[model samples]
Target: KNIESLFDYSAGQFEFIDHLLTMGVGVHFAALIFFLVVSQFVAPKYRIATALSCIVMVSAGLILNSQAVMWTDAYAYVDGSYQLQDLTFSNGYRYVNWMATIPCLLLQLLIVLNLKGKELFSTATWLILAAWGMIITGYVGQLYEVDDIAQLMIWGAVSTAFFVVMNWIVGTKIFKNRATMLGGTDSTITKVFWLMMFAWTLYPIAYLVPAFMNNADGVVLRQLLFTIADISSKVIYGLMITYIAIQQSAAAGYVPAQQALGRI
Candidate 1:
């Protein structure tokens, strides 16, 4: 939020940040390709979930790409090293990307759960409102992240309230109904769901980075943290959904899914 460079960075630190941001772009686009190709391996009923994950990969990849470009443009290559320049490298629009992607991520889960009709419509609307509140409040808080401590904390707390409701939704709606899904309570899909939950926990921590580690390095670490969280929640979580779909399709006697699993 401040209009000045927060801290100076050595060339190594600068380039390290650069590499991390661009690496996110590379990984996400590569995963996008995998999702598009792998969609055929899942059944038609479950393909929509995979499609939702592809949407996430696309939007998240583009946002990370833009952020990487911003980082690179903000620094001038001079004297055979990186030099700070008078450009604004803002990640504010990341919330806009999150606005679109997070809902798709959750919708993927809802689809995997095989929700339908009234249940699906109402639940989808509820989760979207919660997601909207969570991100918007967090975005508002971020504006005051470096200036007004009270406002930031309050807004962050508000955002967390919506996050808690979302947690409860997933906990009660998805985790509790594990037996109804393709796997047992302690199966691979459930474990992947847990991993997705864990990845989301990283987000608030990254949001708090400006409060705890407000430096040029903190900026880099924040990007690193976000990239890690995005890949896990989107890529790995989507893989689990694909695994579930593959098994379900095979159990339902779909030949492609059976061959996908048996490779025969």
Candidate 2:
């Protein structure tokens, strides 16, 4: 209901941001749904690839949003380590910030694990450097454009839509219908799915619970929770990345797919 709350000089409405986030979030959901439909129709050649592309796009947007948060001068004004006092960054932007961890994890999956024998420390070190630097830059950029949330949300929504469409076109049936199934159920992947659901469910709660309780200092707590939750989620994503690469490689025996399409 706070969707309409806004300032006069500029456009600062809880309702408006909520509407866009809802729409942006909906685009993400739509992408998933599109993937579902595509899974039913895709050529048995690129389903997993399609799904991952969708996942990566969504994750990328979220990562950008997280960086976007740091860009805002309002967020920057917060003291060292970004421990905000009372004013919460529990907006659509904040939620997306949590979502950002996925893409960073995906990058590792695509580059390292897919290549095999890749080192975890290398992936983690490089990604952390990039993410942290972007966070700082984004935080600094916000100083110049205090009222750009709406614009960002619009772009975010658009990106989500594009990703969904891409996934729908590509779908999850990448392996040939006749490809051999090594028959292990990929429990690590199963664990990632469950944890992903848990974190997705929890991120909103971390904010909504405090709102319900009227907790004045909730943002600080929420930030801490988000950080921890994302770290845990990403570690699992790393495992899934390994599993996916190994799974696909083991299945795709023909050197053609292996050399041309590469890892999924």
Candidate 3:
């Protein structure tokens, strides 16, 4: 007996985006474990950073898994175009993932940077709200027909502005504060910050894929680009933060958790 395909293959294509998200779930899960294992090497103060990193990766993984599953059931292919609820070429799951993860991403950096009090909470709130604003507006734009991609573009520009401001704050204010705190130490924090920012810059290109490229190609490109960004932003970046935590702990003469208990 021949099995029928579950999806309407004749209607539209299922691009690599689905596969990429599934892979992302696995990658983040691995990262989550890695962060937890390395966390014992950090001092009590900095261990929280790794703990938060674990949360970030696990949450992102779950959300990516949800996005992967949703793509199979939530989107429709009509007249050779992919639509969400028959409205547009957008999928709400991606924005939903961003809304949830972006703040976690920023918070990991902020915590590692050792911000406190009004400065910490205020900055986190600002960045989180800006991130939410960006994704929410972009999601709203995606609800319109493709003929009104200009709406998407306009919102994209707004989000891009917020993004730039966010980066500026990180580069100038956060970086300077951390540098001052770690005065005369190797520029590990600086290096990690720039590397994370570099990975982050790839996101706008991913965001624009649907606006300029053919839908099928856009799906592949956006998925691939985002997959890379997501892994680098969390896994690679978290490991680097772990390294910093160890360095800072050693500098403070604080023993690793196991060593402190005479177990190492």
Candidate 4:
């Protein structure tokens, strides 16, 4: 379980992941611009949700940029193989991005759901706390992910507990409002639910990658997972939230929402 063992892969084995790190940069920045341009397309009441989506993109893009730099800084091509430099490239940094992004991401859902008064404040409080708990606990586990399996499993379990608590809230408290917030036969909440789950569940799997395969292939796999997870959770999920916002905007008689399709 030597820590440096993870960093011993050659360039031929790691070029795809190098490309993937760079790829995350563009996807997120493009989403940032797209969200900003379309923020006005949603209802006034839901505009904050769109703006929060922009925040997600901004954080993601910047994080990806940092990751790209870190990848280069952590490795130096020498003697036909990439050597580990002073820094060790760890996907653990993604947690920093998640910490900033998750609260705002869920806040967008609450805003779009239009939960008022106590329901808003109360649920938002717990959701934010659970997100912090989830990400923080996961970070603790990842600190040991390179070699300490016992520590990794322990903290990862704690993180999973928080994930379940979050699922309970969204599945019950939030989903129950779909009929009122999104209306009959909408299926919007279900779509968002599955999309969010698909993205979120992938994280733990990626998190555990090092435990089983602590080598270049594992690093590549984890980075690939990180790329997809960020894209789906931030870009696609935000777009879905905006979709609901626009639908509501049209119902509320907002002019742009009403005529965006060119004349009702």
Error of 3 at 70 (Å): 2.7
Task: Select the stronger candidate by lDDT from 2 and 3.
Answer: 3
Whose lDDT is greatest here?
A: 4
Ranked by TM-score from best down, the candidates are 4, 1, 3, 2
**What pairs collide in candidate 3?**
none
User: How close to the true structure is residue 75 of candidate 2, measured as C-alpha lDDT?
Assistant: 28
Per-residue lDDT of 65 in model 1: 90
C-alpha positional error of residue 247 in candidate 1 after TM-score superposition, expressed in Å? 1.5
Per-residue lDDT of 1-264 in model 4, one digit per residue for the tens?
A: 334346666887667767887888888788788878777767778899889988898888888888788778878888888888887666666798798899888888887777778998899899989989999999988888766889998999999999999988877755677766732214786788888999999999988887878777877778888888988999999988888887787777787877763453
lDDT of predicted model 4: 0.81
What lDDT score goes with residue 113 in model 2? 27
TM-score, candidate number 3 = 0.80
Q: Which ten residues in a row have the lowest lDDT in candidate 2?
A: 1-10
Best-to-worst lDDT order: 4, 1, 3, 2
lDDT of 3 at 108: 67
lDDT of 2 at 48: 50
Q: What is the C-alpha local distance difference test score of candidate 1?
A: 0.80
Q: lDDT by residue for model 1 over 59-133, one digit each (tens)?
A: 988998988888877877677756569787776778998899888988878777767779878888899899899
lDDT values for all models:
0.80, 0.39, 0.70, 0.81
Candidate 3 residue spans exceeding 4 A from truth:
1-15, 73-90, 145-147, 181-186, 257-264
List, residue by residue over 206-229, the lDDT tens digit for candidate 3: 767667774455666767887898
Return the TM-score for each candidate structure. Answer: 0.92, 0.37, 0.80, 0.94
